[PDB]
Amino acid sequence: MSGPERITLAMTGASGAQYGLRLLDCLVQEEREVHFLISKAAQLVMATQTDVALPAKPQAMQAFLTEYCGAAAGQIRVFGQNDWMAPPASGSSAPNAMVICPCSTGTLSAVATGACNNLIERAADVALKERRPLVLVPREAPFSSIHLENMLKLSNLGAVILPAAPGFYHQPQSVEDLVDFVVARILNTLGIPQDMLPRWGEQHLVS
Amino acid sequence: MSGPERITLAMTGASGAQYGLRLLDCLVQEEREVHFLISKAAQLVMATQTDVALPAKPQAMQAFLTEYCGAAAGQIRVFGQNDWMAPPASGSSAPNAMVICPCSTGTLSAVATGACNNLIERAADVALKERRPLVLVPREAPFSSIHLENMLKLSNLGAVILPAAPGFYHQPQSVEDLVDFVVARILNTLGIPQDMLPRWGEQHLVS
Amino acid sequence: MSGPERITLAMTGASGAQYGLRLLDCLVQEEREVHFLISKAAQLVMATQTDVALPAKPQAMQAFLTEYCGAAAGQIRVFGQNDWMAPPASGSSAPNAMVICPCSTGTLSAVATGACNNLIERAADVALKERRPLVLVPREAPFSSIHLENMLKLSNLGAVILPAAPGFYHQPQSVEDLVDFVVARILNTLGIPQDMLPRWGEQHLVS
Amino acid sequence: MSGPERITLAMTGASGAQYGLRLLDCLVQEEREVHFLISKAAQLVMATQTDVALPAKPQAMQAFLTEYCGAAAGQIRVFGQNDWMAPPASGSSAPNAMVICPCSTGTLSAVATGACNNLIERAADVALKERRPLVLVPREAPFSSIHLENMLKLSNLGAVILPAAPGFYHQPQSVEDLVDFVVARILNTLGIPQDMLPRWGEQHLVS
Amino acid sequence: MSGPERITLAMTGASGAQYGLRLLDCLVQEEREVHFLISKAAQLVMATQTDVALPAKPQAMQAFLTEYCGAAAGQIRVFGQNDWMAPPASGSSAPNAMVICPCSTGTLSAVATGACNNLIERAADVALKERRPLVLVPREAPFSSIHLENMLKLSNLGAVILPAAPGFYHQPQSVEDLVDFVVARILNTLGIPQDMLPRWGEQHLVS
Amino acid sequence: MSGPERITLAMTGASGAQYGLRLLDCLVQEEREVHFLISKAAQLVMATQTDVALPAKPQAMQAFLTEYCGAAAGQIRVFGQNDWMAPPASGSSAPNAMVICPCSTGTLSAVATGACNNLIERAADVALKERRPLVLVPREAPFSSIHLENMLKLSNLGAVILPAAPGFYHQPQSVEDLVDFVVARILNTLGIPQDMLPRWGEQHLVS
Amino acid sequence: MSGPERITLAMTGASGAQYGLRLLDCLVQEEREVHFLISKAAQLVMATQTDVALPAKPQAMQAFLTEYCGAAAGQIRVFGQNDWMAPPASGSSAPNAMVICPCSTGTLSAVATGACNNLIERAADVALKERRPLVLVPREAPFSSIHLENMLKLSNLGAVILPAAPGFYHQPQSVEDLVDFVVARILNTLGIPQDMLPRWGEQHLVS
Amino acid sequence: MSGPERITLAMTGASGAQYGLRLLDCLVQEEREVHFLISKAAQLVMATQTDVALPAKPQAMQAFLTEYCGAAAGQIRVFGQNDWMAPPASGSSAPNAMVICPCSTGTLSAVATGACNNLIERAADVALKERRPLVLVPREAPFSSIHLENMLKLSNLGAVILPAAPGFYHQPQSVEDLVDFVVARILNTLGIPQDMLPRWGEQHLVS
């Protein structure tokens, strides 16, 4: 299989829960193991901007998402915000790629500064120290210079800053086509197969 | 009237022509005067990703857009890429706000470095030196550190970096609702009235 | 009216609650709408260093302050520390000026880094990204280089760093005259009329 | 009226007294109130490079300039170099815009470093801390890296660096036409009406 | 005795002469030797904002202050602004701590840049090169980025930036209680005993 | 002969063609060899702001300028914008000094960044790498921080930033006297004799 | 003749007047023209640390030094601290090399920041902008980081920082031999012949 | 006793061996314990520029210096350049102050970069990490920007950069008086009593 076997998928409190849920579903379809984390503010976002009724507590959540995505048993793990027992808290864990989708400006700040307030922030601190893939998907506008400085510091280290800024080059017709464009770019960054967005110019031999 | 009387609207070669066209229409409806500029690459984008058949030459373009938006006569000016006779080339021009929507990574580079290759880039060079409003709407993903450094330099000067990264908090149902979200944010940045996106929490008195 | 119609007034845990309360009263007298936020540590400060018995919960607080200042109904809103439903959480809100008076070194840190831990910090993150007025009133001594770096970053962006450092040039006779000096400077920064501190030299024509 | 009601006009010891005198006259014609300051070295410049015999002491100066410009009584104030009683010494003064025209390299240095040696330098220190308009008009060549660093620091804060570098695009025929070009640019920066330099391209609708 | 035997106390032209005079009195009561310097602008401040009629010339000043504080003979020295014969001009002097209370923004600038215009500025230049204690007590608001950069540079070297920003945690009832709070903090920084401000929490054993 | 035997004189699209033409004439009178380059935008400037009808193509241009200045045969070479065969394209060329007079903000940008878009920009890239004299004569106002950063980078390398900012100390009576002042400063920078501007103070022995 | 024909020699208030006087004598013996400037504090140094009774006023000074060095008539000019009529005030002056020997930390500060307080500081500002030789001879110990930063900025521009730090490699036997070592190094920096310090290793062919 | 009980005195290959030998003698007279290190190049300097015939090997050296200074038995230790067994190699050693007198530009480089090539360089690396006093006495002229950057980095950390730049304010009559001035400044930096240089102004009470 190309790309990582295990992804840590963290959802934080930016207005684009759609992207995290779509990504989780694609990752499940590509038979990857997902370690799923969600912040308190992301729960509010999902409750108010989606028609997904996500249970509050990690075990009920894990059962709900497993059902929602058609996952295999144990394919989606769910860890709470202070569960230091969980793999992402230590670099001695098995190698994961980590994606924060969507990434609030507060989580972006914490990763840039090393705050490690909760398991999402510590998981990203660990990704960085271990040189493991770390992809952040901010959704904010405008971006202030505070935001941009935090993104630049992290980009210069090797994190991938992938804004929820979908393109219009594959004839999008729906909200879902725009969500899929961003998800397709994430999966391309991770090295995981996807067929939602064609390979640009793959047919073009000359001119 | 609140906000600027004249907007310089430049469209460059990023994959989000939809946003520039929607903005142009809203600006026309709010009875503003638009000085409209478009790059060669933006013409290709519009030809391949929209169903707008925009004429090539400035006078035919001006007539086409005037018809497309229901504008008044002389309300939309069109200037070509080397028309140094046009108002945006000099700071002795009447005060405009400038928006580059969408803003390619190449145009973002040129504005950050002061390249002044064409009238769009010189117009933004002039906005900056005159302390006039300058809003850039990039659409790219990932953003590299090259992109982020150019955005940060310009943000620190006072330009507004407003990524085409629409939010999901007003129940979007279509591609057009996502385009309108970004346009609404642009108009809010400019200080121009809009009714596509409500004022968050305007009704909420306590809790 | 000169100056802003709505002020977001945040009180945080520095030893100068007197200044926030006096400002709130002046803003009420100038018929402005105040969106009032207070941190947990600021509640402790007010309980221990003032003779104001402020209720804990936002609705009781709102009623208490309305009475304390002689405000009109709905003139003072109160929002809790995780009330993301409130206007200051989103840049799509109506335009406010924001003042953090007093501004603890922890809140100053969070604004400088973009931490967005609570509604005060996110409100200031939003002020910055929207280019809306942001005034911070620190009260600490010494200022360490950590403090000074955070103040400088924010000043360079455009925030106003206004230390609770009153002057002695208008013959102060009481603690209240010193509190009013600082409040008068805040209101001058905001562009709001005040008659506590004369205009220096307004009578002086020559020498 | 558009633009500021009161301008602090400081003249310092660069070789372009012509520009300060012309500006003072235009400001008087536009019915603004001018708080006029001049350095010791600027007095030497004016005595040696102009045919204006300016009296030395502030009251005689004030009478002379009032006559020279046809000003109204009290329209031009004159303050000496250590007159800390004067409005520009304190940010509690009424809001002025400040222009240093011409701005010597020594005054540029002092403003950049915060030296506050005299009332001109303190007035600019106050403009900066209050976020009031500050325009510097250097006249030097070459500009060394010392000069350029001081200009850049101040530009990045928000001061306007407007070199006495007139353009040739409005058919200048005399020394006075070149002086007026620079003055027209200053007044445009301040937002004050002027009819010496047309609005570039105002007639041009297309091409 | 704890703390330094000799303090160089410089008063400069910020609006807080009260703090310098109170400090001088406390230092006298703690039987320290004070080398007292005052700027021209500080003399104006003291004449206009206090009821202390300080003589102009150093010997008459020295006699006046000796009387004002109840000092012993030779306990207070006074040196003029160009008295390079005085101890603070050379690092070969006996070890002093230096406090600039209050510290104008101009003196802060000069110390940060090394200007050495007068004996106060050279005395602080010498403190720094000798690694002797240097405490600056600014009183200004807002602080601009010029001010903040100068404070940060000096803080990073090891100077103590102690703003005249008194706290409200010891139940202040008068102007004098606020002045004493700042003075108490200065003396704590210097390591000199004081009983105006208790040791916070000294009684608190647990919770 | 003092100063360089060959000057590369590049004219770019800033509003001060007068200075480049006057310099070219003085260089011809001092029997130097000039390698003359002009940009497309500079041709527009010269056509609209002067009464010089300069032919478009390099050979006709060369004949025209030779006649205009009274030059000797082969004394003025003209090279087109993509003529990489010309000496300034390679550092293996004979040693020239280079002057860009006037220097647009776009050419200033390109030299600062190393863009090498055309022969002028590559010629300056080569001057820098070879440590050959490079003088830039910008004419713009205001100078933005973009402009100032590009000027500072180049000044710090060793380029001379000489703004078209003439002085008034030699009693100028006409537009030509102001043009000559700037040209005289250029020639002084190059080390080439000139008698338009006296040596300041050459007669003054004491006081 | 090798090296410059005219030297501007400025003496400022550091404890090494011996070096400036010795240099002045050597420059006179090498038949150079010296434009001699001295600060107020340097006069105090020379009065207290040497047996040279230097007259106060420029004309009497000029006569005294001419006699002291055996100079030719007009070979030494003397200019006062505000004599802007003198050649060093303008870059349009004839080309000089400038040496500040000794260079106080205050003069070093002023040159680094561009303060231009007096003719010495402006003369060095002009040397820098004209790319003329500028040699500073500090005498201080320790050097603080303020001193070192100012020296580094100026060194990076191209000034020569030549500390009064004589070496012991030519068998010094007296105070004068140490003074001559430093003077010999200055003259070597300037390119002026000297026979006080041999050329190291000039005889050594191998090993 | 005031000041440190043990000094690590390192001599490196700059031309001022006189200062290290004089310091060693003064330290011996003040009954301190000296851990003495010398580089290979410093041995050459001492052999060629002094009349001290220092033995090559550490034990013979130790006996020679003990005799030369009249030291007590065990008062001077000598350690070779690779003697990692010696106290200065480890921060677990007893607390020393370290002086590198004279400090070559190569040793200054190594300390600034952390090279730790030999025991002198490691000893200074250890002083820094332990926050123990570190004084460097360079003797070079000019100082290049390489030298100045290394000095500034180390000064900013807390090392004392004390150039062998003696002053002339105590009437020096011989080479030895200049050597003693520098040594006196070193001892003052260390806090060790000395009577070679009086306390400046200690007698001066007023003026």
Ligand SMILES: CC(C)=CCN1c2cc(C)c(C)cc2N(C[C@H](O)[C@H](O)[C@H](O)COP(=O)(O)O)c2[nH]c(=O)[nH]c(=O)c21
């Ligand atoms: C407010 C409105 C209507 C839009 C903003 N949107 C958002 C929606 C909702 C419905 C909530 C609730 C919160 C936001 N925020 C703010 C954000 O969650 C917080 O700053 C928060 O402290 C983040 O903590 P975490 O990093 O998730 O631990 C937030 N943050 C952000 O970076 N991007 C967003 O789109 C939005």
Ligand SMILES: CC(C)=CCN1c2cc(C)c(C)cc2N(C[C@H](O)[C@H](O)[C@H](O)COP(=O)(O)O)c2[nH]c(=O)[nH]c(=O)c21
């Ligand atoms: C390629 C494809 C399929 C997607 C990228 N998209 C884009 C679409 C199309 C259909 C074209 C043609 C070009 C782009 N580009 C590249 C871009 O236009 C260029 O770098 C170009 O030189 C820009 O010049 P201007 O600044 O407009 O003068 C570009 N640039 C960018 O910043 N964002 C984009 O979305 C896209």
Ligand SMILES: CC(C)=CCN1c2cc(C)c(C)cc2N(C[C@H](O)[C@H](O)[C@H](O)COP(=O)(O)O)c2[nH]c(=O)[nH]c(=O)c21
């Ligand atoms: C301790 C004493 C006696 C004085 C300090 N004073 C203060 C008084 C009291 C009585 C309390 C309780 C707390 C402080 N603090 C510390 C401060 O509140 C905290 O660091 C805190 O986490 C701030 O969080 P917020 O930003 O308000 O969310 C604090 N912070 C600060 O910046 N300035 C202060 O004056 C004081």
Ligand SMILES: CC(C)=CCN1c2cc(C)c(C)cc2N(C[C@H](O)[C@H](O)[C@H](O)COP(=O)(O)O)c2[nH]c(=O)[nH]c(=O)c21
């Ligand atoms: C010398 C000659 C012939 C030309 C330079 N010109 C000038 C002319 C005259 C005729 C005088 C007298 C002085 C100058 N200066 C220098 C300048 O005034 C000073 O450095 C001075 O200390 C400035 O203090 P201020 O900032 O005014 O308080 C100066 N400074 C500057 O920045 N630009 C100039 O054009 C000139």
Ligand SMILES: CC(C)=CCN1c2cc(C)c(C)cc2N(C[C@H](O)[C@H](O)[C@H](O)COP(=O)(O)O)c2[nH]c(=O)[nH]c(=O)c21
């Ligand atoms: C103006 C008014 C009403 C308030 C400002 N206040 C002040 C009061 C008075 C009554 C005087 C006269 C001067 C000030 N200043 C300005 C200041 O003294 C100067 O910039 C000055 O050149 C300082 O030089 P020194 O550093 O003392 O040598 C000054 N500077 C500053 O840093 N803080 C202040 O509070 C005030």
Ligand SMILES: CC(C)=CCN1c2cc(C)c(C)cc2N(C[C@H](O)[C@H](O)[C@H](O)COP(=O)(O)O)c2[nH]c(=O)[nH]c(=O)c21
């Ligand atoms: C617009 C008007 C009325 C005034 C500005 N003036 C100017 C006049 C004219 C009449 C033209 C046509 C162009 C300018 N420009 C802009 C400039 O030429 C361009 O940015 C351009 O791309 C430069 O490319 P080059 O570096 O020459 O290759 C330009 N650029 C600049 O740096 N300074 C100027 O004075 C002016």
Ligand SMILES: CC(C)=CCN1c2cc(C)c(C)cc2N(C[C@H](O)[C@H](O)[C@H](O)COP(=O)(O)O)c2[nH]c(=O)[nH]c(=O)c21
């Ligand atoms: C104090 C004593 C005993 C030694 C210090 N020495 C010196 C001696 C004398 C006998 C005087 C009087 C002054 C000094 N100074 C200080 C210095 O002159 C000043 O800071 C001053 O303002 C300099 O202004 P200028 O740059 O000359 O315009 C000064 N400055 C400096 O950089 N190096 C020195 O050696 C000394």
Ligand SMILES: CC(C)=CCN1c2cc(C)c(C)cc2N(C[C@H](O)[C@H](O)[C@H](O)COP(=O)(O)O)c2[nH]c(=O)[nH]c(=O)c21
């Ligand atoms: C050459 C001559 C005649 C004068 C220079 N003087 C010196 C004298 C002698 C007589 C010798 C032999 C060497 C120097 N040096 C160079 C220096 O010792 C070296 O760069 C060397 O590698 C230093 O290594 P260490 O740091 O001691 O381990 C050196 N280095 C330096 O920083 N200052 C000096 O004064 C001198």
Ligand SMILES: [K+]
């Ligand atoms: K959480």
Ligand SMILES: [K+]
């Ligand atoms: K184009």
Ligand SMILES: [K+]
């Ligand atoms: K809280």
Ligand SMILES: [K+]
């Ligand atoms: K003055």
Ligand SMILES: [K+]
């Ligand atoms: K003074």
Ligand SMILES: [K+]
């Ligand atoms: K071209």
Ligand SMILES: [K+]
């Ligand atoms: K002087």
Ligand SMILES: [K+]
């Ligand atoms: K060695």
